[PDB]
Amino acid sequence: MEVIELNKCTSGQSFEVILKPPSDPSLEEIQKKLEAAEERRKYQEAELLKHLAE
Amino acid sequence: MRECISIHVGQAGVQIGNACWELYCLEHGIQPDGQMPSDKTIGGGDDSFNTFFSETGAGKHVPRAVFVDLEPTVIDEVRTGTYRQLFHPEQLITGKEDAANNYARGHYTIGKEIIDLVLDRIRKLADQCTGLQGFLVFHSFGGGTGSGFTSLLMERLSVDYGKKSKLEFSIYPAPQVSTAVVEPYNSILTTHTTLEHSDCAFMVDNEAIYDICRRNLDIERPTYTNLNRLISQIVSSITASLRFDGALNVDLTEFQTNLVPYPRIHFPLATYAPVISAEKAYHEQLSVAEITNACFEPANQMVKCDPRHGKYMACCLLYRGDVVPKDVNAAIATIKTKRSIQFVDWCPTGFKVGINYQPPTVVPGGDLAKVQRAVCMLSNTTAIAEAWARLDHKFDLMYAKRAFVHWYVGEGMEEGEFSEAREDMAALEKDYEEVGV
Amino acid sequence: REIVHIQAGQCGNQIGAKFWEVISDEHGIDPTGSYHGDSDLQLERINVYYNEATGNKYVPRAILVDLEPGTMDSVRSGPFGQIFRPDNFVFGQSGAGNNWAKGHYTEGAELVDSVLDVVRKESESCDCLQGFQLTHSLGGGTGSGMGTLLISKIREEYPDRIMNTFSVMPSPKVSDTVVEPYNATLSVHQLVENTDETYCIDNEALYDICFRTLKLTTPTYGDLNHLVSATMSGVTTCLRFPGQLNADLRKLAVNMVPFPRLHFFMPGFAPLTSRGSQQYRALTVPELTQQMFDSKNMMAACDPRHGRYLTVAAIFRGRMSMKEVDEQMLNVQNKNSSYFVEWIPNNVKTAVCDIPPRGLKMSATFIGNSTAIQELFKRISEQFTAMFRRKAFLHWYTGEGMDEMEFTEAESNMNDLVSEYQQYQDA
Amino acid sequence: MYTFVVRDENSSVYAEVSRLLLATGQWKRLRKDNPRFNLMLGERNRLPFGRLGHEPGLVQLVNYYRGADKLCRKASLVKLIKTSPELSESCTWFPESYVIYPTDEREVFLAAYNRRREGREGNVWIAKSSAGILISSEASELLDFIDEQGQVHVIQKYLEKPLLLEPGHRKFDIRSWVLVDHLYNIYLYREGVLRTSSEPYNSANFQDKTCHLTNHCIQKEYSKNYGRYEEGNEMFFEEFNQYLMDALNTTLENSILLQIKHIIRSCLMCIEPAISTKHLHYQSFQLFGFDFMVDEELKVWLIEVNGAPACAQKLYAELCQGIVDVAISSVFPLATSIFIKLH
Numbered sequence A: 001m002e003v004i005e006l007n008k009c010t011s012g013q014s015f016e017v018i019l020k021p022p023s024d025p026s027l028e029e030i031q032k033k034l035e036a037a038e039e040r041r042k043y044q045e046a047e048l049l050k051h052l053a054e
Numbered sequence B: 001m002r003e004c005i006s007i008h009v010g011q012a013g014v015q016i017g018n019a020c021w022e023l024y025c026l027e028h029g030i031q032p033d034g035q036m037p038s039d040k041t042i043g044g045g046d047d048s049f050n051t052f053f054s055e056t057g058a059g060k061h062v063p064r065a066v067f068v069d070l071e072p073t074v075i076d077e078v079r080t081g082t083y084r085q086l087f088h089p090e091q092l093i094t095g096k097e098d099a100a101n102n103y104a105r106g107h108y109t110i111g112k113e114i115i116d117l118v119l120d121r122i123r124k125l126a127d128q129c130t131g132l133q134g135f136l137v138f139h140s141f142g143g144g145t146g147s148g149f150t151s152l153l154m155e156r157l158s159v160d161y162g163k164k165s166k167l168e169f170s171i172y173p174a175p176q177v178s179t180a181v182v183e184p185y186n187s188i189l190t191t192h193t194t195l196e197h198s199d200c201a202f203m204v205d206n207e208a209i210y211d212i213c214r215r216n217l218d219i220e221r222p223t224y225t226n227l228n229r230l231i232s233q234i235v236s237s238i239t240a241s242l243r244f245d246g247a248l249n250v251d252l253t254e255f256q257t258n259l260v261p262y263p264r265i266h267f268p269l270a271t272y273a274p275v276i277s278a279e280k281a282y283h284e285q286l287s288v289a290e291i292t293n294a295c296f297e298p299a300n301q302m303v304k305c306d307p308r309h310g311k312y313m314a315c316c317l318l319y320r321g322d323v324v325p326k327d328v329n330a331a332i333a334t335i336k337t338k339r340s341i342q343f344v345d346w347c348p349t350g351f352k353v354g355i356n357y358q359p360p361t362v363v364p365g366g367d368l369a370k371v372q373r374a375v376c377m378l379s380n381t382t383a384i385a386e387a388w389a390r391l392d393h394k395f396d397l398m399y400a401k402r403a404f405v406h407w408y409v410g411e412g413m414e415e416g417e418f419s420e421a422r423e424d425m426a427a428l429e430k431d432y433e434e435v436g437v
Numbered sequence C: 001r002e003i004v005h006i007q008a009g010q011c012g013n014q015i016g017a018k019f020w021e022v023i024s025d026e027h028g029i030d031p032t033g034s035y036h037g038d039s040d041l042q043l044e045r046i047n048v049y050y051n052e053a054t055g056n057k058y059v060p061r062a063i064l065v066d067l068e069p070g071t072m073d074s075v076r077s078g079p080f081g082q083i084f085r086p087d088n089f090v091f092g093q094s095g096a097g098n099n100w101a102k103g104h105y106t107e108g109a110e111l112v113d114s115v116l117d118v119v120r121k122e123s124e125s126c127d128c129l130q131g132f133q134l135t136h137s138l139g140g141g142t143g144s145g146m147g148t149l150l151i152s153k154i155r156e157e158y159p160d161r162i163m164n165t166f167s168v169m170p171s172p173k174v175s176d177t178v179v180e181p182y183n184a185t186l187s188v189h190q191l192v193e194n195t196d197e198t199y200c201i202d203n204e205a206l207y208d209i210c211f212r213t214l215k216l217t218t219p220t221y222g223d224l225n226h227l228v229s230a231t232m233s234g235v236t237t238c239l240r241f242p243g244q245l246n247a248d249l250r251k252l253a254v255n256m257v258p259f260p261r262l263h264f265f266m267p268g269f270a271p272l273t274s275r276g277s278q279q280y281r282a283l284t285v286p287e288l289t290q291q292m293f294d295s296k297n298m299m300a301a302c303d304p305r306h307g308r309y310l311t312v313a314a315i316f317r318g319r320m321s322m323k324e325v326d327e328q329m330l331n332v333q334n335k336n337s338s339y340f341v342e343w344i345p346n347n348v349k350t351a352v353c354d355i356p357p358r359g360l361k362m363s364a365t366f367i368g369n370s371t372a373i374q375e376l377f378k379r380i381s382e383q384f385t386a387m388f389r390r391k392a393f394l395h396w397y398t399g400e401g402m403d404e405m406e407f408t409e410a411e412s413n414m415n416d417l418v419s420e421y422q423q424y425q426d427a
Numbered sequence D: 001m002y003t004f005v006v007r008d009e010n011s012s013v014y015a016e017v018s019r020l021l022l023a024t025g026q027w028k029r030l031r032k033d034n035p036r037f038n039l040m041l042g043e044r045n046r047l048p049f050g051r052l053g054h055e056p057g058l059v060q061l062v063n064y065y066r067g068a069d070k071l072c073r074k075a076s077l078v079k080l081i082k083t084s085p086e087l088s089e090s091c092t093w094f095p096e097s098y099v100i101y102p103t104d105e106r107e108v109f110l111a112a113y114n115r116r117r118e119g120r121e122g123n124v125w126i127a128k129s130s131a132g133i134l135i136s137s138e139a140s141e142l143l144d145f146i147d148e149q150g151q152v153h154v155i156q157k158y159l160e161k162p163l164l165l166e167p168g169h170r171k172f173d174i175r176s177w178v179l180v181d182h183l184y185n186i187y188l189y190r191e192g193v194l195r196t197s198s199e200p201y202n203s204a205n206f207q208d209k210t211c212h213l214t215n216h217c218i219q220k221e222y223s224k225n226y227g228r229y230e231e232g233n234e235m236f237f238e239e240f241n242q243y244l245m246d247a248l249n250t251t252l253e254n255s256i257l258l259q260i261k262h263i264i265r266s267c268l269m270c271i272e273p274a275i276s277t278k279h280l281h282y283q284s285f286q287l288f289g290f291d292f293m294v295d296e297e298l299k300v301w302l303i304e305v306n307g308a309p310a311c312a313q314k315l316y317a318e319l320c321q322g323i324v325d326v327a328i329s330s331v332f333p334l335a336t337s338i339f340i341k342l343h
């Protein structure tokens, strides 16, 4: 059990106690996904409006 | 000095953010009008509190913060509340109608329409930073905005600020205060999509906060206000190292370095003590050994789980108040012989300790008694995976019958995203088992 | 934010008028549109149901529809009749003769465009419209046939808004004509496709409650409507006052509707109190909770003990212990856990509002999505089939241009609905 | 009333408890995946402890201590006694054991074994595992037998001088039943059993297993005249105490039972900080079966601990009643004591 890296200041202090040693999608790809979801909403709405027109 | 921008998403993120900034102002001596008498440099400076507050020529201390919600009623309380003069109107962003507890509605349908406005307002904050560290993002798992819009925002922040650290404070759903049946769905969907974009995430289970409020503060039926004031105390003890002079966790990258050896396993368990009722007429001040030992009690954790049956990868002790290193070490020595504290074999068995001499500040008239010393322990233990198992199980029950799935598909999400997200969570559970078993 | 209310036909306008009487009183609005309340909780969400006119005047966002003028003349003459916007009265002269085809295809089709003109005008002055609520019966002609025609037209123009109905189900015990099972089966066919939430208010249950529970020897429609307006006040409490849970139509639908076709709710209320009857006794939180879950207190004539709850919403009103309410709500689930499906965890949600309804210190309103509701559609289907296998009374409908095939399809769709409930009752 | 689920059907002890539970009229059994239970008769393997104690309005009790497999698995127990300060490697009531993988102790065992050949002392060992036994006097055949299988084995000192019941010149092992409730009170059942051997103990050839292994299955099948001295090779405590008074002028309490209570309290208070469910969000209790050996000096040795034990036939009614009385009714109260409290 040893204390290392003791730092002190007027606001407090910090140190480390050791007990035992050891033994992304791009902008375009995001917009693609958002627009694909939008198109799926649009298709589903178009199907509804086609049904109501019948 | 290196700045930090806080982002508060949805009702939970916004209301907790209000609790936090109220507490930050009390801790730094900033008045609700933004003035700070103890700050002798008018309209400038690079002190430690400047990491969270900018300054105007008039001496107003302005939070480096953006509040985002898809309906206006929660942020409206900020616009007319005690600290209304603190925030610039550009920092408070509201839509018209919310995500209706639907991840797909917050992420795809409404998120697509508002994401660029939010990034523009964040850029206005970033443009006033000489050396931005990154972002602290506050949000619920269960809400449609907190889950769905946050995951979109995290993705775009990785694009726009690739070199910046991103930390999360996430509210894990509890039926005792929950508002939606589909919260397990939203939690898994947002965890899958955010996982590769978050460097360190502090999960707070509302059930644990609720029970701590009942058991230790004698609150019969805790409200969000009760919960949020306790949560802000824990958040404040976690972020104090960024806001005050010190040497431990002085920048966002150091949270990952000190707590997350494996990138996917980036959810540290927080434990806080003491939580004492302000209504108690006579208080007995707990010693360093007693509050340190309380850190290994499940009843004091932000997520109920049993660390005796997992392994530790890292452990950080954050003391506030009348604490000296001599007493911390005598406490750690005693606890090691009486507690089940097993580290993984490829990690040192040790503690990084930080002490701030200023005792915890409490809100006047709140529920928390003023104490002379407090501690927040941040520990990366595999036992937090119990929380994923509970969540993944409720997901499985509903998804086997496809209950409520049509609400998500109707917003343009594919049904395959459910199973993709659930498979990612299955691999996450397996990762915890490999490290800890 | 804003809700647009429509009431169609005799039943729809009589229960709609009483609904507006009750909530106007709760929000402190007098019969002339002036606010005279004492609590700011009354005005905080007033815009959900009322437009603001100059002079501090609150006007219901209500459209009154009928194919004959009689009931709407009575509404103008009634207690709060002066509160409605006079341009929002839309009516014909011919009537619908208790005939779904006249409401849906002939007489109603002539009037429907001018109703949509008033709907459009109300929607256009909405800051952010949530959706629509319709009150009507399913057993007549205007509310059933023209009401469902209106729903379909409104969906066409506002496909992304929530559509909610309070639908009064016919019963032989409280019946005006023998063709009610035809009109109701044709209407349910429409409701399964075009509404998001339907409150099933069964005149059979309402009569039984007035007779057995309230000890009313000869129940009238007025007595029945007292139960409905109290239930409607209760189920809209979360929309009208500040609160966290089921606070708008979409969040309620997301919490209550796990499968799009299974959106037919059984409502209930406690304490059950009759017209002009004052009982002064205090009702404890345990007594409210047990009574709101009691089969005898349900307003759809089906037995919840024969099925399982997919989802439940409960609303408590009045000053009471929130700890006790949580404890009692958990007590019911933990002691009778078989009546709640296990594959929807935590499917009972509780809300609490401080403002109690008039005449009571506390009350509780129940909204259940129970698989036992299949018994209601089974009952309608049997009464439909008894007549349809002999083609009895069909000439009233073929004379309006309808074909028998449309009846067979509507019956088939309702029997499918019954089968889908039974499927999740065994899952 | 109270509710419970059943995830482990084969428990003869918790079947009788489940039957007794229903027989009270105040208990009701739920389905398997219904989370609204007061009591879980959980599975022995892979029990989802992580999902317990998170149901608002339910005191949840499971019939197992999570982490009690340390005391109940053979290699785990040998590692516990050696590495625990409260138990020590110098533990005098536990036979010298060595964990041997096919963390290993092959050299440490060869050192003490060869010591026994230098002094010509009794050098008979036994290989066993919680997965499956081979008694030998030569070390080259015990290590070869651990490698033919593929699991962890222990090599324990075989007690060459046991106490022998007369007439018969026969071997026995004692089973004690210990109930530890949610408050971690240690309750030792007043009734134990002696699983005796049917054929005379034979130290010449460890080949014939029947006279050396006292298990009820190995005696029910491999021994002729099985159950000729006592029904089912089971001598209960009133008969063994009478034999000890007649044959040895001592009692079962003095010569044997004080040591048994000592060992039970040693092992259980040892792991108590690592498994206790005090201040945990779900409570636990567990019935344990200790297996003891008595040598010719009337000294008690610990052999193993079973966390999922079966009960003797004539003691099913009394013990399961005590399980319901002390463990379950103390947590869920219904609208003389058969246990000895070890404190």
Ligand SMILES: CC[C@H](/C=C(/C)[C@@H]1C[C@@H](OC)C[C@H](O)C(C)(C)[C@@H](O)CCC[C@@H](OC)[C@H](O)C(=O)O1)CO
Binding pocket: C289, C290, C291, C293, C294, C295, C296, C304, C305, C332, C336, C339
């Ligand atoms: C929990 C879901 C509910 C199903 C039930 C079986 C419920 C459950 C409880 O009432 C909350 C039972 C109630 O405590 C008592 C024991 C006093 C009961 O004697 C009252 C009348 C009988 C009952 O029927 C058996 C009643 O009419 C009903 O509904 O009982 C359906 O909504």
Ligand SMILES: Nc1nc2c(ncn2[C@@H]2O[C@H](COP(=O)(O)OP(=O)(O)OP(=O)(O)O)[C@@H](O)[C@H]2O)c(=O)[nH]1
Binding pocket: B009, B010, B011, B012, B013, B015, B016, B069, B070, B098, B099, B100, B101, B102, B106, B139, B140, B141, B142, B143, B144, B145, B146, B147, B171, B172, B173, B174, B177, B178, B179, B180, B183, B206, B224, B225, B227, B228, B231
């Ligand atoms: N601790 C805490 N939890 C909150 C608070 N507000 C909401 N929650 C929790 O957050 C979850 C609900 O999500 P919200 O944040 O309200 O939803 P949202 O982000 O606004 O998303 P939508 O309303 O669906 O658009 C539930 O589990 C609530 O219990 C709060 O102020 N404090």
Ligand SMILES: Nc1ncnc2c1ncn2[C@@H]1O[C@H](COP(=O)(O)OP(=O)(O)CP(=O)(O)O)[C@@H](O)[C@H]1O
Binding pocket: D095, D126, D128, D130, D132, D156, D157, D158, D159, D160, D172, D173, D212, D213, D214, D215, D291, D293, D303, D304, D306
């Ligand atoms: N060191 C030793 N000295 C003398 N006999 C021993 C011994 N180790 C084991 N035995 C004998 O071997 C038998 C079985 O040993 P053990 O108890 O390890 O097996 P097991 O786990 O299958 C029993 P159970 O089915 O009761 O749990 C015992 O009844 C005992 O008589």
Ligand SMILES: Nc1nc2c(ncn2[C@@H]2O[C@H](COP(=O)(O)OP(=O)(O)O)[C@@H](O)[C@H]2O)c(=O)[nH]1
Binding pocket: C008, C009, C010, C011, C012, C014, C015, C096, C097, C098, C099, C136, C137, C138, C139, C140, C141, C142, C143, C144, C168, C169, C170, C171, C174, C175, C176, C180, C203, C206, C221, C222, C224, C225, C228
């Ligand atoms: N509860 C209730 N039911 C009514 C009322 N008026 C009519 N009904 C029922 O409504 C059905 C008749 O429809 P009605 O509304 O009168 O015909 P419409 O004018 O064509 O819509 C029958 O089932 C009646 O029992 C009423 O005021 N209250």
Ligand SMILES: [Ca+2]
Binding pocket: B039, B040, B041, B042, B043, B044, B045, B046, B055
């Ligand atoms: Ca300054």
Ligand SMILES: [Ca+2]
Binding pocket: A024, B158, B162, B196, B197
């Ligand atoms: Ca990144």
Ligand SMILES: [Ca+2]
Binding pocket: C094, C110
């Ligand atoms: Ca005409």
Ligand SMILES: [Mg+2]
Binding pocket: B010, B011, B071, B098, B143, B145
């Ligand atoms: Mg919200």
Ligand SMILES: [Mg+2]
Binding pocket: C010, C011, C140, C176
């Ligand atoms: Mg009529």
